[PDB]
Amino acid sequence: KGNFSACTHSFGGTRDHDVVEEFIGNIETYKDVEGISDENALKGISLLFYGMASTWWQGVRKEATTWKEAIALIREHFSPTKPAYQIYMEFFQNKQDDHDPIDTFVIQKRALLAQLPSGRHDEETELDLLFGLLNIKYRKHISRHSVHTFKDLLEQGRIIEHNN
Amino acid sequence: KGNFSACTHSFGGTRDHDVVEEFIGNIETYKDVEGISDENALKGISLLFYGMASTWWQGVRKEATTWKEAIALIREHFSPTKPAYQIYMEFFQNKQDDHDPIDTFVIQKRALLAQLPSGRHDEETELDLLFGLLNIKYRKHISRHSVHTFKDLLEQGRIIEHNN
Amino acid sequence: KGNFSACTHSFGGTRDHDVVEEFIGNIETYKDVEGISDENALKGISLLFYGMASTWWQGVRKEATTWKEAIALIREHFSPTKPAYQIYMEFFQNKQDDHDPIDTFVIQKRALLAQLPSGRHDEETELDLLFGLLNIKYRKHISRHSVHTFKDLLEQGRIIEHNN
Amino acid sequence: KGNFSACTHSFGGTRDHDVVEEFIGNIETYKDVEGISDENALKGISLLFYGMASTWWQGVRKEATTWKEAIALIREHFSPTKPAYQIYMEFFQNKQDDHDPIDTFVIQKRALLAQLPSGRHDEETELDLLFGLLNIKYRKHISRHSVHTFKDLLEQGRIIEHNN
Amino acid sequence: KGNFSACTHSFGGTRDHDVVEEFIGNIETYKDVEGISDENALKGISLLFYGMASTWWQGVRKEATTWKEAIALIREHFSPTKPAYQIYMEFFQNKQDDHDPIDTFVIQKRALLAQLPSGRHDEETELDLLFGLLNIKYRKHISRHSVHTFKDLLEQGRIIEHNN
């Protein structure tokens, strides 16, 4: 049942990294689960676009010979893969305001530090870079030489949050 | 037909106990009814998240080796299983206002007294703890040494409600 | 194909007779049409509730041993089957205002006179009880000893309506 | 696959000719395409009504022995098939205002002149009756003894529209 | 499975080129993917229209003997294929305002220059006609005798955009 006919996943070019990555991951997981022979997914790729994207596909259809080239064309035309220094400045911009728990903040900061080139930064320097931008209410009790991985920091922050 | 492809049940991290319990129960009942071999449900778990949850899964995917560990990770990260005394204080907080029948109140108070540790409280002390927070209009006619289980209390309250 | 997996019929406890009767009729017609072996419909009844009803089912699940007991539990907990005299008073309350045709009024009055105990009232006394609460515009031309069943009254009212 | 289980076509009694005709045509085309043995469509007709129509069906279910009688009951109870002179007066009522092309006007006037009794009016008198109620901007250039069928009138009106 | 029964693509006559072209492309790709024997698609074409289009089909049904004639009737009645000079004037009308990247503008201008008669204009004159209507911020750095195809212009514009 790999006719790519019944799928409720869509895309319309909203120009943001998260929506594009969600769409690409959902398509590739669907192809891995239901079963496509890696050629029928090119003949039925036009059943998922709407609005501004369908005009783009009817424009640039004649430069797609495989599947990986089409997925690379989507990722290159709708995400310009931002350089190094703007990510660091955006990262140090925001502080952790009150009425915001640890889980949302740690999820957003770990989603931001994945657009750097891979293999440059291990876990310890990443946690040391994260630890400065936390509020005083947690930081009075969770001082260093006590955590080594993000799971322990999340656990102790959750205990200090739900305790009082 | 266990490809976990066609399912209209979703979750997006609303941070509440009831939505999480409803989602977990619906997934587990779907797996019991249609038929999954307990390994294909891990390869297709990513077809049910959207929004804030998909970034969380793309973050913490590498710490899930079975199915029960993933369901425990969901229940532990999105519900911090509140302690004993806050449930008792929240329970004695609200009184039963007028223009509210017995069924809604009894359903909410029985949904609240299930987050305690199991095996501490049987039925009689639970009904004796519930009986104080009822309005005078029912309580003038349904005096004690007449009911022993919640079905009889609901029945006599329904008769006194629909009679006049 | 009786896995009770794909069905777009739902219920959430709106506390009204018509919604409950519509939901029960749609479920029972679905079971008669597609084919269930009268035991699989109990294992998959939890795929149709949402919101306030799912907490109610997780509360009272342990008092359902068959299918008819579960359908009776729904009908008894969400409809208190109103007594005799309130139906008669509600029935004589409303008059037929202008800018309202015969079909809507006759449908509502025949939907109200079905909650009485069966076998007490035949067709002739029911039409004689209905005939008093009609407007003067129809009643100047449709005088008695001319109709015996509701079809003839609807037919002559429709002719007098669409004629002028 | 004729269980009349998966169909996204519905009806709720909006009291208009066009919605009823669309619903009847969609049901009959579905029965012609998928394959029903002309008896299973009566046992599953109750899976398509909602709201005010389901009470009507639970009222008048016991006067339907075949399929054509049920479709005639729908067409007779929800469309009173308007008489001759009101259609002619409604037809000559409206004129063709500016900022309205030929296609919409011709479609509406041909949809109105189908409720007359059939076999009374051929094509030539119908076009001669239509030609009076057109604006001066088209009528200065499309004078008679030049068109004989509606296709030619639509074609020359479209040329005069898109030319200037 | 070519009964044209389950399809979530619809059309209602919005009178625009893009919606009509999207609808025609989606239908033809569906027929190429799932499998129709080129005669069953005419018996089930009426399961996709709604509103104003269904009255049009019930009007003009008797002038469709094949599939290509029906698709040509749709394209001719709902798109009047605009002449040459209005496309050129509309094309030179708009300039590229700030806070608008290169991809959206190039997609719209390449979607507009496809309604001309084919075989008149190759790639070089098209890029030379496009290059005049760009803002000064890109045009200070991307001067000519450096690009020959639209891919290189998009690439250098994307580098100059995401660099500063």
A·E CB contacts under 8 A: 50
Report how far Cα B7 is from the mean position of its chain's Cα atoms.
22
Q: How far apart are CA A126 and CA A115, in angstroms?
A: 14
* Mutation to test the D interface, candidates C17, C18, C99, most D Cβ within 10 Å: C18
> Whose CA is closest to C123, among C155, C101, C104, C151?
C151
CA nearest neighbour of D50 among C31, B157, C19, E137 = C19
**Does D52 lie at the interface with C, CB-CB under 8 angstroms?**
yes
DSSP SS3 for A141: coil
Query: How many CB atoms neighbour CB A94 within 10 A?
Result: 12
Q: How many angstroms separate the CA of residue B141 from the nearest CA in chain A?
A: 43
Strand partners, C11: C49
* Whether the Cβ atoms of residue A96 and residue A105 lie closer than 8 Å to each other: yes
Radius of gyration of the CA atoms of chain C, in A: 21
Given a contact cutoff of 8 angstroms between Cβ atoms, the answer to whether C50 and C12 are in contact is yes
Cβ pair B47:A29 closer than 8 A: yes
Which helix (H) or strand (E) is D54 found in, with range? helix D52-60
In terms of residue numbers, what domain contains B11?
A: 1-164
Q: Give chain E's largest Cα–Cα span.
A: 62
Going by beta carbons, is chain B in contact with chain E, meaning 3 or more pairs sit under 8 Å apart?
Answer: no
Residue pair A70/A107 in contact (Cβ under 8 Å)? The answer is no
CA nearest to B47, candidates C5, A30, A3: A30
Q: Phi-psi region for residue B81, left (φ > 0), alpha (ψ -120 to 50) or beta? A: left
Chain A contact set for E101 (CB, 8 A): 15
In sequence order, what are the residues at sequence separation of 6 or more whose Cβ sits closer than 8 angstroms to the Cβ of residue B71?
B24, B28
- Per CB-CB distance under 8 Å, the chain E contacts of A7 are none
Give B123→chain C minimum CA distance, Å: 14
**D57 in contact with C at a CB cutoff of 8 Å?**
no
Question: Pick from A18, A33, A110: which is nearest to B5 by CB?
Answer: A33
**Residue indicated by tokens 């002309």:** D38
User: How far, rounded to the nearest angstrom, does the alpha carbon of residue A159 sit from its chain's CA centroid?
Assistant: 28
Contact C58 B25 (CB under 8 A): yes
d(CA D17, CA D80): 9
Task: Inform me whether the C-beta atom of residue D115 falls under 8 Å from chain E C-beta atoms.
Answer: no
Note whether B123 and B68 are within 8 A (CB).
no
Q: Which residues of D touch C29 (CB under 8 A)?
A: 43-44, 46-47
Question: In this structure, what token pair is assigned to residue D50?
Answer: 């909602």
Residues B153, C114: Cα–Cα separation, whole Å = 30
CB within 8 Å: C22 and D50: yes
Residues from chain B contacting residue A110 (CB–CB below 8 Å): 59
Residue type, A47: L
Evaluate whether E70 touches E45 at the Cβ level (below 8 Å): yes
Are D111 and E77 within 8 A, CB to CB? no
Residue B11 pairs in a beta bridge with B49
Binary contact (E26, A46; C-beta < 8 A): yes
Contact E154, A76 (CB under 8 A): no
Tokens of D128: 């001669």
The helix/strand/coil state of C11 is: strand
Determine contact: C21 vs chain D, CB below 8 A.
yes
**CA nearest to C53 within chain B:** B107
Q: Virtual CA dihedral for C121, C126, C132, C137, nearest 10 degrees? A: 170
**Cα dihedral value B25, B29, B31, B32, nearest 10:** 140
Query: How many structural domains comprise chain A?
Result: 1
Q: Using a CB cutoff of 8 Å and minimum separation of 24, what contacts does B45-49 make?
A: B45/B4, B45/B70, B46/A25, B46/A26, B46/A29, B47/A26, B47/A29, B47/A30, B47/A33, B47/B4, B47/B5, B47/B7, B48/B4, B48/B7, B48/B9, B48/B10, B48/B11, B49/B10, B49/B11, B49/B12
Would an 8 Å CB–CB cutoff place C120 in contact with chain D? no
Chains C and A touch (3+ CB pairs under 8 A): no
Phi/psi region, residue C9 (left: phi>0; alpha: psi -120 to 50; beta: rest), is beta
Beta bridge partners of A11: A49
Of E32, E111, E162, the CB nearest to A43: E32
E83 and D CB contact within 8 Å: yes
Q: Quote the DSSP letter at residue A33.
A: I
Amino acid at B76: E
Distance from CA of E163 to the nearest CA of D (A): 47
Whether residue B5 lies within 8 A of chain C, CB to CB, comes out as no
C-alpha distances (whole Å) from D51 to each of C12, C22, D19, D20, D57 are: 16, 8, 16, 16, 11
d(CA E70, nearest CA chain D) in Å: 15
Whether chain B has a CB inside 8 Å of the CB on C46: the answer is yes
CB count within 10 Å of CB A43 equals: 13
Q: Which two tokens stand for residue D41?
A: 């469509």
Those residues whose C-beta lies under 8 Å from the C-beta of residue E81, and which sit 6 or more positions away, are E115
Say yes or no: E108 contacts chain A, CB-CB below 8 A: yes
| Cross-chain CB nearest to C59 (options B111, B158, B161) | B111
Q: What angle do CA B80, B86, B90 make, to 5 degrees?
A: 115
Experimental method: cryo-EM
Min Cα distance E6 → chain D (Å) is 8
Counting Cβ atoms within 10 Å, is residue D113 exposed (0-12), middle (13-18) or buried (19+)? middle
Do the Cβ atoms of A133 and A95 come closer than 8 Å? yes
Angstrom distance (rounded) from CA C114 to CA C126: 11
D38 touches chain E (CB under 8 A): no
Residue B6: list chain C partners with CB under 8 A: 5-6
Give the integer Cα–Cα distance in Å for B122 and B134.
20
Give me the DSSP letters along B75-128: HHHS-----HHHHHHHHHH----SS--HHHHHHHHHHHTTSSPTTS--HHHHHH
Residue A85: list chain E partners with CB under 8 A. Answer: none
Task: List the beta strands (DSSP E) in chain C.
Answer: none
Q: What spatial distance separates the first Cα and last Cα of chain C, rounded to whole Å? A: 53
State the residue for tokens 């003839």. C152
In whole angstroms, what is the distance from residue C25 CA to residue C23 CA? 6
Chain B CB within 8 Å of residue C50 CB: yes
DSSP-derived 3-state class of residue B11: strand
The distance of D44 to chain C (nearest Cα, Å) reads: 7
The beta-carbon neighbor of A47 closest among E18, E21, E26 is E26
Residue C73 CB contacts under 8 Å (≥ 6 apart), including other chains: C60, C63, C64
Give the resolution value in Å.
2.8
| Chain A contact partners (≥3 CB pairs within 8 A) | B, E
From the CA of B84, how many Å to the nearest CA of chain A? 12
C-alpha–C-alpha distance, residues E135 and E105, integer Å: 11
**Rounded Cα gap, residues B23 and B11, in angstroms:** 7
Distance CA(C22)–CA(C9), nearest Å, equals 10
| C72 C-beta neighbours (distance < 10 Å), count | 12
Q: How far is CA B128 from the centre of its chain?
A: 22
Put simply, whether C57 touches B (Cβ < 8 Å) is: no
Tell me the two tokens of residue B11.
Answer: 């979750």
Gyration radius of chain B's alpha carbons: 21
Which residue is associated with the tokens 């089930």? E44
User: Are the CB atoms for B33 and C45 separated by under 8 Å?
Assistant: no
B110 to chain C, any CB pair closer than 8 A? The answer is yes
The owner of tokens 């690409």 is: A24
Cα E23 to Cα A37: distance, rounded to the nearest angstrom: 27
Chain A residue nearest residue E17, CA to CA: A55
Q: For an interface test with A, give the residue of B1, B4, B5, B73 to mutate (most A CBs within 10 A).
A: B5
Q: Is there a contact between E87 and E120 (Cβ–Cβ < 8 Å)?
A: no
C/D Cβ contact: 3+ pairs below 8 Å: yes
Question: Which residue from B163, B125, B121, B123 is spatially nearest to B142, judged by alpha carbons?
Answer: B163
- C5 contact B CB<8A: yes
Residue B107 to residue C44, Cβ atoms within 8 A: no
Which residue bears the tokens 């922050």?
A: A157
Which strand (E) or helix (H) includes residue B152? helix B150-163
Chains touching D by CB (3 or more pairs below 8 Å): C, E
